[PDB]
Amino acid sequence: RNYILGLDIGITSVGYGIIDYETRDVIDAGVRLFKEANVENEGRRSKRGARRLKRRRRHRIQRVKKLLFDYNLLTDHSELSGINPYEARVKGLSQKLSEEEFSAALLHLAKRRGVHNVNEVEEDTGNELSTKEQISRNSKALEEKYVAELQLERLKKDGEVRGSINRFKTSDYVKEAKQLLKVQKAYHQLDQSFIDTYIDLLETRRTYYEGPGEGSPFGWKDIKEWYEMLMGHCTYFPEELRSVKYAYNADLYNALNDLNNLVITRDENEKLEYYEKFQIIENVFKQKKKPTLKQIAKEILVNEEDIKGYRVTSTGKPEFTNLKVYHDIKDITARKEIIENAELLDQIAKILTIYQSSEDIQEELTNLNSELTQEEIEQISNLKGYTGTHNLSLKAINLILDELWHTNDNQIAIFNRLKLVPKTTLVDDFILSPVVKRSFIQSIKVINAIIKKYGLPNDIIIELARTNERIEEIIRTTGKENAKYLIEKIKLHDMQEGKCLYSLEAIPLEDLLNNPFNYEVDHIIPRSVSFDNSFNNKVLVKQEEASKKGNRTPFQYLSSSDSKISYETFKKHILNLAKGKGRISKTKKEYLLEERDINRFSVQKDFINRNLVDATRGLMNLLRSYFRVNNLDVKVKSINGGFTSFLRRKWKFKKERNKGYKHHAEDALIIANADFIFKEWKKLDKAKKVMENQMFMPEIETEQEYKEIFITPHQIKHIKDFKDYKYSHRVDKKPNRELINDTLYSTRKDDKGNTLIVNNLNGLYDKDNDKLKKLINKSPEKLLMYHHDPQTYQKLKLIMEQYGDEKNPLYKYYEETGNYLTKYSKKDNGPVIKKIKYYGNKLNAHLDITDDYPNSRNKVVKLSLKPYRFDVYLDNGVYKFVTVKNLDVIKKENYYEVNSKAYEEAKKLKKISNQAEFIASFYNNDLIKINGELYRVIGVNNDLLNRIEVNMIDITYREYLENMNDKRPPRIIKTIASKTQSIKKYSTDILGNLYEVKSKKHPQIIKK
């Protein structure tokens, strides 16, 4: 039948409600679920560029060692084992050097080649590790002496060269690398092309328009295709590409608006005519960069005060379009031949904004075959500010630029008068975030599939869902780890300056963290009338104040004798904060300040009209656009999220929302009952009309009337009763997931024969880290310093007992002495301890990459080996299964195949045979029938232990347990066995229906 389509949009879940348009009976209802998306996994695109950065240093070195073999300065015979290249680049400038002592000083340079960006600017020294500070410091010390020399001077005195101080400009390197080759030049016969090719292999590097190579998708073919897919498309003619915001024509179209909006009190026509608009441009606008209002109004003989209809900046001066082409070109060239012609000027600006280097401009300024003296082109490339793009293509400037001249029209009315109009995959281009992009995309698929099984609905009503550098400051200032839970309380504490707005007494942070129960988060305007769950409605106050207030407005509760403070002192302290910077929200100020009574109804419907009703804007218009394009009539509206935190409340819906996933599909039905109430009433057809944004009556008059319309506790009895919910869980078939964690671990072998991972306690002398204290006093047998070289250890343990009352005795130690923990030595020459390795838990699974490293005595592994999938097999009445890991699926050019070398070994290692029947595969989140019982596959807990972990469907197991109160270990770990009676694979469509799948063969190839 006809039905309303309700939808709850969260990040993890899509819920839908299907209630009939008339009978109010519900046809179907379910929830579609998936894991939240992550944009922090920035790494994929950065590492793609960051991996090439490691190649940028690596490519330079490989080329110069190979280039020397071609020049025959180095051969495979040569040995470089002994060099100390920080001395070779000092003996190199002074004296003749070998063919082995010269290739090193070159290559150590070729590897570490400095920056170009940082040289240009300098700064002062502010006791920091900046790059504008360090290179500013470095070259003053290096003004007299060259890079290596001071580095070598630094080697002689500090004992350490590498670190923060070793950044440099590519110049000093190149200036000294031009200084060096000047000395060995006569000692080994060589060309100038070598002091060209090498100095090009040491300094030269890419820039933001060359892109990577040809085969890369990330790479492009020329400078034209770079911009030709980074510039937007016309608001009216999107098939073209946006013109440059600074082309002469656009810069002119942007001025024929300036004056076609002007109104002037003249007995003649108020909006300037063509000859007026001609000479003004030609006599004063062309002649003067910025024209103040006087200049136009003087050349056009009217009084200065008269002209109105002009854009004005905040200071008050009128702003009219600046011709960027004329004055940059006319400041060096006034010749009749380019300057009159707009098309000449039109192309010039395009080349300037597109290509980005003065040298690359003159090449393309030349291929125009236009007639500019070549002295101009080489200084026309020395101008700046030719940046940005108009929001209108060139096919939309030249078409209507004439009709701006003669008439007095402006751009909007011309496009109206010219019958020209603005404009799942479609979600990507405009949408903001990966979190939303996932929810919408699956929500569309829901609709696109519901109508196919159910038909065209009539009403599709949709609701959406509703400073971590501040946390790092107080878990480090105070030392209280638990700063993670009370974010919404603390963001309020900065924004209110440590006071209680309903008491005006100070709220110490240390006191609030110790006693959070002392201080609550009161809702300014009550949740029951405001319906504002946003930040703005919340104010961190003392409990006793919010306790004494209750269900009232601040003005009410402050004015009464119950509150000791008064509105008068409240009114003055409130606004002072409001003005300034880092200031309080405005709806906040609109919230605290309102003085009208809540019960009068001419007040209540204002709130419901304001916050409660009315990407959201974007999502809706992709829906109405589908419907309007197809001449298909279905009404689609929206409603804010807080409404369903209300309708749930007034109808006494369940507070203890612990039933699980179905507390979504519950919402969509409520959303559906809501639009129904909007629908049926005629006292609601003025508020239910702008929600569908239709072009146009009864409205509600007292608060009992409203409370008559949206309080129906008795007629909703069908929703709680509903028992046919069907669930659908998203399965991630995608490969090229994160193969494994980045960090490399070393290992050892203990006395027993286990293989054991070693870790690093990196930062020392930090107030946060007490783990130096914790791990010493429980199992110090894990410290490498304790096992051998314990002589350093007893010095370590004594400070851990000397300041054993302070969280990290080392800061307290470094506080006193001002000297780091020194390794044991006879004459105080022991190296400072800056890390301390320690043993780890035995590595069950590892990625062995030792072969990348030679002659190592220990194994080198990256942890976080993961299992991808697992195909159950049926081996003659006994159920066995293989597990296939993430590491196994080898990547390729356009597909991700499975390694039959490891899968086959895994078939023998699992005692699988050739004769066994094959049962389907079970990726994470797929559903399985073991012993007639159905659960969702979280994954293989242990291939070796013959285990998988599953979780429940209508609920998470922990939550089922919390309902059962059993307190077993809250995870399911069913054990595959010979005893297991049945293995069937169930999956679900997006709607939530369950279907049995029959499988005959296993696949090893995925295309991504």
Active site residues: 8, 523
Residue 45: which of RNA, DNA, none does it interact with, CB under 5 to 8 A by kind?
RNA
Separation between Cα atoms, residue 107 and residue 783, nearest integer Å: 39
Stretch that binds DNA, among 307-315, 789-797, 823-831, 832-840 (CB under 7 A): 307-315
Restricted to residues 753-792, the positions that interact with RNA (CB under 7 A) are: 758, 760, 762, 784-785, 787-789, 791-792
388 touches DNA by CB under 7 A: yes
Tally of CB atoms within 10 A around 17: 27
CA atoms within 13 A on the CB side of 641: 11
Q: Which is nearer to DNA, 257 or 899 (CB)?
A: 257
Q: Which is nearer to DNA, 240 or 806 (CB)?
A: 240
Q: Which is nearer to RNA, 311 or 649 (CB)?
A: 311
What residue numbers does the annotated binding site for RNA cover? 745
The DSSP 8-state label assigned to residue 318 in this structure reads: B
**Considering only residues 1, 22, 53, 705, which one is a binding residue for RNA as defined by CB under 7 A?**
53
What stretch of H or E contains 440? helix 434-454
Give one DSSP letter per residue of 360-378, joined into a string: HHHHHHHTT-----HHHHH
Separation between Cα atoms, residue 842 and residue 753, nearest integer Å: 11
413 touches DNA by CB under 7 A: yes
The DSSP 8-state label assigned to residue 320 in this structure reads: -
279 touches DNA by CB under 7 A: no
Restricted to residues 796-815, the positions that interact with DNA (CB under 7 A) are: none
Taking Cα atoms as reference points, which of 635, 440, 608, 696 lies closest to residue 4?
635
Q: Apex CA 651: angle with CA 646 and CA 657, to 5°?
A: 70
CA distances from 941 to 836, 902, 937 (A): 33, 19, 10
The dihedral region occupied by 996, where left means phi > 0, alpha psi between -120 and 50, and beta the remainder, is beta
Stretch that binds RNA, among 13-21, 59-67, 333-341, 481-489 (CB under 7 A): 59-67
Residue 758: which of DNA, RNA, none does it interact with, CB under 5 to 8 A by kind?
RNA
Separation between Cα atoms, residue 1004 and residue 932, nearest integer Å: 29
387 touches DNA by CB under 7 A: yes
Shortest CB 605 distance to RNA, Å = 20
**Considering only residues 356, 358, 759, 942, which one is a binding residue for DNA as defined by CB under 7 A?**
356
Residues in contact with DNA, counted by CB under 7 A, come to a total of 37
**Considering only residues 78, 84, 117, 913, which one is a binding residue for DNA as defined by CB under 7 A?**
117
CA dihedral 524→525→526→529, nearest 10 degrees, is -160
Q: Which is nearer to DNA, 350 or 552 (CB)?
A: 350
Strand-pair category, 726-729 with 26-33 = parallel
Residue 112: which of RNA, DNA, none does it interact with, CB under 5 to 8 A by kind?
RNA
Q: With contact defined as beta carbons under 8 Å apart, do 247 and 345 qualify?
A: yes
Shortest CB 794 distance to RNA, Å = 12
Q: Which is nearer to DNA, 205 or 718 (CB)?
A: 205
139 touches RNA by CB under 7 A: no
Taking Cα atoms as reference points, which of 18, 2, 10, 12 lies closest to residue 671?
18
- Sorted by sequence, the CB contacts under 8 Å of residue 877 that are 6+ apart come out as 978
Binding mask 743-782 for DNA (x = CB under 7 A): x---------------------------------------
CA distances from 587 to 40, 163, 526, 538, 612 (A): 32, 50, 14, 11, 14
Restricted to residues 237-266, the positions that interact with DNA (CB under 7 A) are: 242, 257, 261
Restricted to residues 60-89, the positions that interact with RNA (CB under 7 A) are: 61, 63, 65-67, 81, 83-86
Q: Which is nearer to RNA, 114 or 291 (CB)?
A: 114
Taking Cα atoms as reference points, which of 783, 785, 765 lies closest to residue 775?
783
Alpha helices in 158-193 (DSSP H): 170-181
Give one DSSP letter per residue of 691-706, joined into a string: TTT--------SHHHH
Q: Which is nearer to RNA, 348 or 539 (CB)?
A: 348
Shortest CB 81 distance to RNA, Å = 6
Stretch that binds DNA, among 310-318, 487-495, 537-545, 622-630 (CB under 7 A): 310-318
Residue 387: which of RNA, DNA, none does it interact with, CB under 5 to 8 A by kind?
DNA
Q: With contact defined as beta carbons under 8 Å apart, do 312 and 318 qualify?
A: yes
434 touches RNA by CB under 7 A: yes
What residue numbers does the annotated binding site cover? 8, 463, 664, 745
Residue 160: which of RNA, DNA, none does it interact with, CB under 5 to 8 A by kind?
RNA
Q: Which is nearer to DNA, 115 or 190 (CB)?
A: 115
Burial of 451 (0-12, 13-18, 19+ CB in 10 A): middle
Separation between Cα atoms, residue 34 and residue 627, nearest integer Å: 28
638 touches DNA by CB under 7 A: no
Stretch that binds DNA, among 147-155, 176-184, 735-743, 887-895 (CB under 7 A): 735-743
Taking Cα atoms as reference points, which of 676, 656, 660 lies closest to residue 716?
676
Residue 413: which of DNA, RNA, none does it interact with, CB under 5 to 8 A by kind?
DNA
Q: Apex CA 712: angle with CA 707 and CA 713, to 5°?
A: 120
CA distances from 269 to 295, 308, 621 (A): 20, 14, 42
254 touches RNA by CB under 7 A: yes
Q: Which is nearer to DNA, 151 or 389 (CB)?
A: 389
891 touches RNA by CB under 7 A: yes
132 touches DNA by CB under 7 A: yes
Q: Which residues bind DNA (CB under 7 A)?
A: 50, 115, 117-118, 129-133, 208, 227, 230-232, 242, 257, 261, 308-312, 314, 353, 356, 387-389, 391, 410, 412-413, 430, 741-743, 862
